[PDB]
Symmetry: C2
Subunit: 456 residues, 2 copies
Amino acid sequence: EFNILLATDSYKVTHYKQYPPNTSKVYSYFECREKVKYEETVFYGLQYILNKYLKGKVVTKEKIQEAKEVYREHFQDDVFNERGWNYILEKYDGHLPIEVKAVPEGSVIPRGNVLFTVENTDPECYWLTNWIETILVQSWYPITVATNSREQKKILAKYLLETSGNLDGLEYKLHDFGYRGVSSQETAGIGASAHLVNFKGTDTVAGIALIKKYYGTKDPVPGYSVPAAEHSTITAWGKDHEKDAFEHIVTQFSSVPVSVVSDSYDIYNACEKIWGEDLRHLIVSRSTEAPLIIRPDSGNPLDTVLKVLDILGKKFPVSENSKGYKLLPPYLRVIQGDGVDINTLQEIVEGMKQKKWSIENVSFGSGGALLQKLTRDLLNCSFKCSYVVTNGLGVNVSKKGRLSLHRTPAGTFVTLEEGKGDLEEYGHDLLHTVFKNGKVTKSYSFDEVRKNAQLN
Amino acid sequence: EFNILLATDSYKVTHYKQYPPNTSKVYSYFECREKKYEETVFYGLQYILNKYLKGKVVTKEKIQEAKEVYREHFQDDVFNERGWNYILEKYDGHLPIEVKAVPEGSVIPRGNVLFTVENTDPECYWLTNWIETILVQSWYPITVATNSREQKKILAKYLLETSGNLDGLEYKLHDFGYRGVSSQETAGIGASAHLVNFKGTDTVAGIALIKKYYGTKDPVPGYSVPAAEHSTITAWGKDHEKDAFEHIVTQFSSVPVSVVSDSYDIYNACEKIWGEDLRHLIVSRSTEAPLIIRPDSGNPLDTVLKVLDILGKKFPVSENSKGYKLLPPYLRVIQGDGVDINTLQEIVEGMKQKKWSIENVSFGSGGALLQKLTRDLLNCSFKCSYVVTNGLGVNPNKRSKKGRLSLHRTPAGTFVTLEEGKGDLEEYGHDLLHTVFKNGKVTKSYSFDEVRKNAQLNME
């Protein structure tokens, strides 16, 4: 199926012919170098990569021959280390002789600290470290998604608290609508799973499948969604049957919440006449677990939320909570999924507070904004060789030498270099061996991942 | 392997309970809308059709898996088990939809229908909305192929003006985006899209995709060359950079070799090492295997200009027929840092002002070519435009299209998208859209050779 001998940058293929004689070790590391400032990042995703692509017998005679042919044509010359891959196949039954150490999945670590390290375990495979860089560095994506998601969660927790006095339901405040905005099916799954580290709402079940497959969970409902009615289905009934459309929907989905666009024809007539009275007997009767969620009209993200809230406020009973903020009845809520990114989320929620509107009233959705438009540059994700051993001599190639992560008694994180960690300075290394010679040596359930990524 | 019943936005799962009774048709379309990148390269649909939609994609096992997944996901039974079983029993699991599209590789101006989708069996009215997700992801290869072609245009302009021809244009932009994209699948798709316009890529997966889903007569559709970076050269120590260089050039002499030159000494490497010390091993390299020098970091233009100058003094520089400086055939430069469509223009412009032929330099694009792209760059939009209920028809950015769409060209060759089925009259040339998928079968397929031909630049 997938061939790891063909999963590296092409130029790295020739590295086994570029090192000095007797090079026995190449040690490399990944960090989110320093440079809404993302001060701390969530380390998430390496486990997926290790399990899906690196563990077990990943080298076969068949795969060796495939790579030899592919590369012969690619470089128009035989520059493929066939013998080197044959050694791995025969010596370790196709298992990769490398060791990867990393901070636990879900850990929140400030920028500029070692997150994981990679090195070969057999001197003959000094070239392997550079080779697997490509596959490992893609962990930047789930790290970045989990990080940007958590930052948005911090914004939501702050205002939810100040406006309601608590954080109940925080986990359902930001929904992942990024399926259609990402670059591939695989990316959709990875990204959705990274969002689920922080929240539970997603429209990409592939995220849940990845979690259950690569991490494991005891959580009864790790990821959820609610039926949603959009323009495409409502307008199919016609302007004269919008009421029938609305009644049909709410009656079809009465035991769970339901999202319905109010912008199909006229939000006023829809909220004031249809919802307001014509079908009122179907709304007020809904449980607090299955509220009607109104998806505001098109326009400015903040303005629209207020407008719809003010309208609804005029037709339904609003009350002030213990914190003194306007709160719609339990059977009625609002969702803003258009133009909501990390920066805009701020202004929106900010405006709501200043207008006496509680955050309990609204939830948000983000699409290609939280799964796409993100790059390695956001957190300055960097992978580099920091230590090499040639002719028995240890040399430093960014951070220098062998690295280790530590947390001081004051609760600060520090990455010690040049093997200084060996001096047992600041306790024990926080990086743990997760992969060694083809075997995943330490794994985490998704429950642990979420616990480690929890808000401070 | 893959369960298409689980590959749609969640909220679309319940649509089979949202339409009026006897809704028999749902017709939707895809376009790169314009406001108020003038042309896009349509590429990638065929990969999706063949990999995910064709053949028997529904099985009892998949239907059951979906039922369980959605029951937990929605906390209620809102999965159309009956509707999917119907496809399994009536069409042996083949999807009853028809997709029409402009040819793969075709160049179409913005604001025009590119592909359409509709159910072929009235009982499957709900299927059109369902597959939107998987089909709209074509926005990615479309965008990559389009952006890549725009850069090709810039390079073509300056290569022609500075050398007189476009020889070797296909090797001027190398794809180094493997490490900068979000996944393995995305790497392959993206690399394939770049290969629509160029041949250099460091992602062999892109070539695999081309051969598997398109096919080619080209004996070498994608290529790369050995390259030496800092992590490998610095391993030798500052005092052995010359040996590192010597070793590498000797190792790879029948093929071109890329070598970083800013490890330690930037001037000494070009002047002394490459010059006085190893010149004998460079001037001897054939024109098919030149030494490729990769410049230091910093401003991309300044660095390119500074490197050419240093070399241009230690090596014999000529003057082509257009009067621009040209390095000897065994020596070239590559700039793979900080290059995107905006920076590319500034660089080639700078070289022209400095009288340097574009022949001397090639470029590399990474994350800024396969990741710094979104659906909004080209305003990729998918929308329902026609619906039939009870046997009756129903219906910032430019307005959306309505009714049955068709693509044509005026006698002047101007592209026009006709709406409300007006295309039936064929006032202009018949519909340019072709049926590429129908009831589980891919009905029209393009070789990557046709794709590249359709995407060629306009000589004008």
